[PDB]
Unconditional design. Structure first.
Ligand SMILES: [Cl-]
Ligand SMILES: [Cl-]
Ligand SMILES: [Cl-]
Ligand SMILES: [Cl-]
Ligand SMILES: [Mg+2]
Ligand SMILES: [Mg+2]
Ligand SMILES: [Mg+2]
Ligand SMILES: [Mg+2]
Ligand SMILES: [Mg+2]
Ligand SMILES: [Mg+2]
Ligand SMILES: [Mg+2]
Ligand SMILES: [Mg+2]
Ligand SMILES: [Mg+2]
Ligand SMILES: [Mg+2]
Ligand SMILES: [Mg+2]
Ligand SMILES: [Mg+2]
Ligand SMILES: [Mg+2]
Ligand SMILES: [Mg+2]
Ligand SMILES: [Mg+2]
Ligand SMILES: [Mg+2]
Ligand SMILES: [Mg+2]
Ligand SMILES: [Mg+2]
Ligand SMILES: [Mg+2]
Ligand SMILES: [Mg+2]
Ligand SMILES: [Mg+2]
Ligand SMILES: [Mg+2]
Ligand SMILES: [Mg+2]
Ligand SMILES: [Mg+2]
Ligand SMILES: [Mg+2]
Ligand SMILES: [Mg+2]
Ligand SMILES: [Mg+2]
Ligand SMILES: [Mg+2]
Lengths: 169, 386, 62, 98
RNA sequence: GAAAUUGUUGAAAGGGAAGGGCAUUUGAUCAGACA
RNA sequence: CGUGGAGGUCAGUGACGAAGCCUAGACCGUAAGGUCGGGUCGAACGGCCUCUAGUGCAGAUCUUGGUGGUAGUAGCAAAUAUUCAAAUGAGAACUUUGAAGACUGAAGUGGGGAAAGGUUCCACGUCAACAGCAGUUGGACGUGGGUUAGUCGAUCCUAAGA
RNA sequence: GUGAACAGCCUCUAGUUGAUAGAAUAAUGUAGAUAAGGGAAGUCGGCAAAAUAGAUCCGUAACUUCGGGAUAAGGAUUGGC
């Protein structure tokens, strides 16, 4: 399959992807950016600590009118959360990518997250009922997730001046 | 158009903003004017608020209805263990304001002060002031040279002192460090006085005395987020009011098209720095003295501590200051006692005060006994003791 | 397992409400195979399914 | 290690000011927190007999004091059981021999 | 398999909007004649 | 100047890649526009002389379709209330069983019917969608089973009326 | 069962235990409440709230179509054994 823009050697990389996953796009984007560029082992341990509310996922873009916590100090922000559902989907794809790297024969110690990208999948429609007999939409925002792990001229005057200096010192 | 009836404004605009204080220890922003023809002495002292009680005394006020008659007054007790001098600081005059030139510390510092320099004391290696103490390892050239600079250039001298919080029933273990100005004597005399008091203790009776007016500087009790009705004292709206009645109805006219700074708004109440003046000292107690709470008329042997101990504080085992009236701040909070900035002679000051009785009944309820001995005499013998 | 249908049949066979039917929690596998009313009758006979006593409404104070 | 001790928990000061409809459920969570403090185990299991003792007097009739038997078993978990005593007053922590 | 709109990567600017006109500096990029 | 179609002509271009689309790459024209290179793509299309029109959009609270900021925000707070353990399962605050605490309190949250609905009844299998959290559960999904009358009704009689 | 009672309140038979949850307890709300002294000064206006309340006994005015007004007004009593 065709992935996004990458600048890594395909012979030293393994990839995994998931499509039409019914998980929040905005929550998943923040989670994906939290482990982008990290080592595979450190990222996996970090995601487990998020599920136990020991460390938080910083929210940088889709963070309007959310709460603020002290666990954001590690990343230099005030607003952070613990998107458990998004974390579990990412953990599954990290496990699959590591398995694919093992099948190739790559060194698991040197593996780091070189590429990770979240796209918006087509929405699923439901209805909600409003006052005075009106109907509004009630829709989800699924996600497409993909990731890749990789092993770590002179003028005559100028020529004359240069030659003149050579015979001087 | 003009408001139909005229009323005074709600609140005082000179105490803005109503924000939380920057530190739990309130700052002393003014010291008494120095008199160089006096011996060197401190101008302030540090203590911890313990609680309030009641006293009875005669009134000496000619022309008053209650002249030569007993009155009942409320007082506040401040636990004041001796403070320890641990350094001096010199200041010089500049067209931009006073500037600190140098700071000289004592050779040895206890663990109380060192805790102030850490956030994770139980994990640290306690390396603070380890290389500075090596300055004393020589003959003292480094320390003496720094002291000479203060004498040569400084125009204001202050000393660094800390409380002995380990003597209080508090559980903090961390001392409070502060600067206190020295008044009296020349600049050289102030520096010599500070040097000789390194690692020494200064008692409260060496600073204040009986029948003296003092100022109390402390952070008030905090109450969190408060509405306009209680934060500013605005009138409650009628019962018919839709969308709530603990509000201000109109927060501004159409023009200027902005909410003005002088309109009451909801926000933080309490935890503000305050400076209350003209508080007379009623008693300067001694910790090592039995019958702290005794007078010349009562003669019973009882301490200042009420039965059951001060509520939420504990027992008073050190020197204390008894001050008339109420003081900003709550119990357990560090307070600063400051000498008066002016000579008051309103005939309320300069009046000699002699206590005739001090209440020591329990403050945990409607106490009926001053001492356990009095309780046993009234009730007799109980099943518990037999 | 899902013994919702067994409790419905037991109440009808015994003749009491579902609130008075007791199913042995240690015999779930045996109860799960009782899909007929005749099989329910056997479990009542051997004590796997029992009828619970009625709640007492005493008139002594009355 | 494997150790068994008998404790007295003061539920009166842990349920002070709690809503009536939540007092009995709150006492269950306080006991789990109580066992974690003394045993250091995240997994705490309560016997249904203890659950009956908590709910003996309804949702808002939790006893002031309870005598608990806490056993740490084999990575490790705690098992809390009631202790049948006439009164829970005046009892201090003791180690129960296995 | 276009646009609105979106993700990743790369480059650049940002003290209460952004965008534009004339002129040149700097960076990037590029055609024409070697008669 | 540009667009759909028509007569004539260039024995015009093309699967060795036509049309379309993308391209802070190049050239021509004051401009409407025209031309070239690169990428993508797969079957038709253009120059010139003339003919013809359902022939050029930024707006009309324009029509149809699609998509944003708002925003992970408002909110998911009536009807007293849930808790422990085991079993099942990849997964259990919500499924099953047991234990405990509660409620409807016979003008009921009980047991039957009329109108209306039409298989929702029951069993087995099963969880993508639906049950505005969840789900191993379901009035959901897939496949089957089930309604037995001389006496209960219809059918017969007449009422206002047709 | 209580009571005059198919009222309200508690229980047996039977049936449910369903309504997104966890933590915390700021302001402002919605719903439910209490207040020293004064007692409608509030307000268009007693709006809202408070006070009265069952039963037994005593006592009951103007007026009137003689039927009423009337539970007028105004007082006392109430458990258990
Ligand atoms: Cl609509
Ligand atoms: Cl003012
Ligand atoms: Cl042109
Ligand atoms: Cl409120
Ligand atoms: Mg905002
Ligand atoms: Mg909000
Ligand atoms: Mg609605
Ligand atoms: Mg409707
Ligand atoms: Mg209104
Ligand atoms: Mg008190
Ligand atoms: Mg296609
Ligand atoms: Mg686009
Ligand atoms: Mg082509
Ligand atoms: Mg473009
Ligand atoms: Mg084709
Ligand atoms: Mg047209
Ligand atoms: Mg248009
Ligand atoms: Mg126009
Ligand atoms: Mg429009
Ligand atoms: Mg919200
Ligand atoms: Mg609501
Ligand atoms: Mg409810
Ligand atoms: Mg009820
Ligand atoms: Mg009831
Ligand atoms: Mg069914
Ligand atoms: Mg759902
Ligand atoms: Mg679901
Ligand atoms: Mg179906
Ligand atoms: Mg009152
Ligand atoms: Mg009036
Ligand atoms: Mg008025
Ligand atoms: Mg009214």
């Amino acid at each position: 399959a065709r992935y996004g823009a990458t600048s890594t050697n395909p012979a030293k990389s393994a990839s995994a992807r998931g499509s039409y996953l019914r998980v929040s796009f905005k929550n998943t984007r923040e989670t994906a950016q939290a482990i982008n560029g990290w080592e595979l082992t450190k990222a996996q341990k970090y995601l487990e600590q998020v599920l136990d509310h020991q460390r938080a996922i910083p929210f940088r873009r889709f963070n309007s009118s959310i709460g603020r916590t002290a666990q954001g100090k590690e990343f230099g922000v005030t607003k952070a959360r613990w998107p458990a559902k998004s974390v579990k989907f990412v953990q599954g794809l990290l496990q699959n990518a590591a398995a694919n790297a093992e099948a190739k024969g790559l060194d698991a110690t040197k593996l780091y997250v070189s590429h990770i990208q979240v796209n918006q999948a087509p929405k699923q429609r439901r209805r909600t009922y409003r006052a005075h007999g009106r109907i509004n939409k009630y829709e989800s925002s699924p996600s497409h997730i993909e990731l890749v792990v990789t092993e770590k001229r002179l003028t005559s005057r100028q020529r004359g001046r240069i030659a003149a200096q050579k015979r001087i010192a | 158009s003009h408001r139909k009836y005229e009323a005074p404004r709600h609140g005082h605009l000179g105490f803005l903003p109503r924000k939380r204080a920057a530190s739990i220890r309130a700052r002393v922003k003014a010291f008494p004017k120095d008199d160089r023809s006096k011996p060197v002495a401190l101008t302030s002292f540090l203590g911890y608020k313990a609680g309030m009680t009641t006293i009875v005394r005669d009134l000496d006020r000619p022309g008053s209805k209650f002249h030569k008659r007993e009155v009942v007054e409320a007082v506040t007790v401040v636990d004041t263990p001796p403070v320890v001098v641990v350094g001096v600081v010199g200041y010089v005059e500049t067209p931009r304001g006073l500037r600190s030139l140098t700071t000289v510390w004592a050779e040895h510092l206890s663990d109380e002060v060192k805790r102030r320099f850490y956030k994770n004391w139980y994990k640290s290696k306690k390396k603070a002031f380890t290389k500075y103490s090596a300055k004393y390892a020589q003959d003292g050239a480094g320390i003496e040279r720094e002291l000479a600079r203060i004498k040569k250039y400084a125009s204001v001298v202050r000393v660094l002192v800390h409380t002995q919080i380990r003597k209080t029933p508090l559980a903090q273990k961390k001392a409070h460090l502060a600067e206190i100005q020295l008044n009296g004597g020349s600049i050289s005399e102030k520096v010599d006085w500070a040097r000789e008091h390194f690692e020494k203790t200064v008692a409260v009776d060496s600073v204040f005395e009986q029948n003296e007016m003092i100022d109390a500087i402390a952070v008030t009790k905090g109450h969190g987020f408060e509405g306009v009705t209680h934060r500013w004292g605005t009138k409650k709206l009628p019962r018919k009011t839709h969308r709530g009645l603990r509000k201000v109805a109109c927060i501004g006219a159409w023009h200027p098209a902005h909410v003005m700074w002088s309109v009451a708004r909801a926000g933080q109440r309490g935890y503000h720095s305050r400076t209350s003046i003209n508080h007379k000292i009623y008693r300067v107690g001694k910790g090592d003295d039995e019958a702290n709470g005794a007078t010349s008329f009562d003669r019973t042997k009882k301490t200042i501590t009420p039965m059951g101990g001060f509520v939420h504080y504990g027992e008073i085992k050190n020197d204390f200051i008894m001050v008339k009236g109420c003081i900003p701040g709550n119990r357990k909070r560090i307070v600063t006692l400051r000498k008066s900035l002016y000579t008051n002679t309103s005939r309320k000051a300069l009046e000699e005060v002699s206590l005739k009785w001090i209440d020591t009944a329990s403050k945990f309820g409607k106490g009926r006994f001053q001492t356990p001995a009095e309780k046993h005499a009234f009730m007799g013998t109980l099943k518990k003791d037999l | 397992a899902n013994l919702r249908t067994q409790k419905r049949l037991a109440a009808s066979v015994v003749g009491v409400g579902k609130r008075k039917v007791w199913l042995d929690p240690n015999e779930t596998s045996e109860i799960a195979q009782a899909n007929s009313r005749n099989a329910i009758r056997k479990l009542v006979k051997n004590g796997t399914i029992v009828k619970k006593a009625v709640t007492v409404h005493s008139k002594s104070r009355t | 290690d494997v150790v068994t001790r008998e404790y007295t928990i003061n539920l009166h000061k842990r349920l002070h000011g709690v809503s009536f409809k939540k007092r009995a459920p709150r006492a269950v969570k306080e006991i789990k927190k109580f066992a974690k403090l003394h045993m250091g185990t995240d997994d705490v299991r309560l016997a249904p007999e203890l659950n009956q003792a908590i709910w003996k007097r309804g949702v808002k009739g939790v006893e002031y004091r309870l005598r608990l038997r806490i056993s740490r078993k084999r990575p490790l978990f705690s098992y809390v059981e009631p202790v049948l005593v006439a009164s829970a007053k005046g009892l201090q922590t003791v180690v129960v021999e296995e």
